[PDB]
Amino acid sequence: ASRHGQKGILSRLWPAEDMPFTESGMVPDILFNPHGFPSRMTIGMLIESMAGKSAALHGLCHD
Amino acid sequence: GGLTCASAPQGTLRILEGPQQSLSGSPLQPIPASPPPQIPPGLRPRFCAFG
């Protein structure tokens, strides 16, 4: 789950070389479907994603 | 010692302590607004693109 009430079930442990790596070098760690959003309307997982990415890039903890 | 009766009293004065004046101030004292969040000073790109 997350902290925005959005359960997932672990379906497939995908090998790391098959993951979509980014332009910075990073693989992801959990892939989340864009079809869990529009019926559930958790905007708070979007702001938490931007917020935690920007807090891990600055040494900050965000309010 | 007979204690005869008397007429009907006209009015009844009620003595009571006065209202609490000068307790409340004429302006109000609110809790101040929690500030909007600031972009912190000293933010720079620490990630350089590799290679």
Swiss-Prot record, chain A:
Domain of life: Eukaryota
Subcellular location: Nucleus, Nucleolus; Chromosome
Residues involved in RNA binding: 7
The family this protein is said to belong to: Belongs to the RNA polymerase beta chain family.
Annotated domain remarks: The active site comprises the fork loops, the loops and the rudder that stabilize the transcription bubble and assist polymerase translocation.
Subunit field text: Component of the RNA polymerase I (Pol I) complex consisting of 13 subunits: a ten-subunit catalytic core composed of POLR1A/RPA1, POLR1B/RPA2, POLR1C/RPAC1, POLR1D/RPAC2, POLR1H/RPA12, POLR2E/RPABC1, POLR2F/RPABC2, POLR2H/RPABC3, POLR2K/RPABC4 and POLR2L/RPABC5; a mobile stalk subunit POLR1F/RPA43 protruding from the core and additional subunits homologous to general transcription factors POLR1E/RPA49 and POLR1G/RPA34. Part of Pol I pre-initiation complex (PIC), in which Pol I core assembles with RRN3 and promoter-bound UTBF and SL1/TIF-IB complex.
Function of the molecule: Catalytic core component of RNA polymerase I (Pol I), a DNA-dependent RNA polymerase which synthesizes ribosomal RNA precursors using the four ribonucleoside triphosphates as substrates. Transcribes 47S pre-rRNAs from multicopy rRNA gene clusters, giving rise to 5.8S, 18S and 28S ribosomal RNAs. Pol I-mediated transcription cycle proceeds through transcription initiation, transcription elongation and transcription termination stages.
Disease: Treacher Collins syndrome 4: A form of Treacher Collins syndrome, a disorder of craniofacial development. Treacher Collins syndrome is characterized by a combination of bilateral downward slanting of the palpebral fissures, colobomas of the lower eyelids with a paucity of eyelashes medial to the defect, hypoplasia of the facial bones, cleft palate, malformation of the external ears, atresia of the external auditory canals, and bilateral conductive hearing loss. TCS4 inheritance pattern is autosomal dominant.
Protein name (record): DNA-directed RNA polymerase I subunit RPA2
Protein species of origin: Homo sapiens
Gene: POLR1B
Swiss-Prot record, chain B:
Gene: POLR1G
Complex formation: Component of the RNA polymerase I (Pol I) complex consisting of 13 subunits: a ten-subunit catalytic core composed of POLR1A/RPA1, POLR1B/RPA2, POLR1C/RPAC1, POLR1D/RPAC2, POLR1H/RPA12, POLR2E/RPABC1, POLR2F/RPABC2, POLR2H/RPABC3, POLR2K/RPABC4 and POLR2L/RPABC5; a mobile stalk subunit POLR1F/RPA43 protruding from the core and additional subunits homologous to general transcription factors POLR1E/RPA49 and POLR1G/RPA34. Forms a heterodimer with POLR1E/RPA49. Part of Pol I pre-initiation complex (PIC), in which Pol I core assembles with RRN3 and promoter-bound UTBF and SL1/TIF-IB complex.
Biased segments, Pro residues type: 29-41
Disulfide bonds: none
Misc remark: It is in an antisense orientation to and overlaps the gene of the DNA repair enzyme ERCC1. This gene overlap is conserved in mouse, suggesting an important biological function.
Residues of the full protein shown: 103 to 153 of 510
Role: Component of RNA polymerase I (Pol I), a DNA-dependent RNA polymerase which synthesizes ribosomal RNA precursors using the four ribonucleoside triphosphates as substrates. Involved in UBTF-activated transcription, presumably at a step following PIC formation.
The protein, known as: DNA-directed RNA polymerase I subunit RPA34
Family from the record: Belongs to the eukaryotic RPA34 RNA polymerase subunit family.
Lineage: Eukaryota, Metazoa, Chordata, Craniata, Vertebrata
Cellular compartment(s): Nucleus, Nucleolus; Chromosome
Residues modified as Phosphoserine: 26, 34
Region (Disordered): 18-41
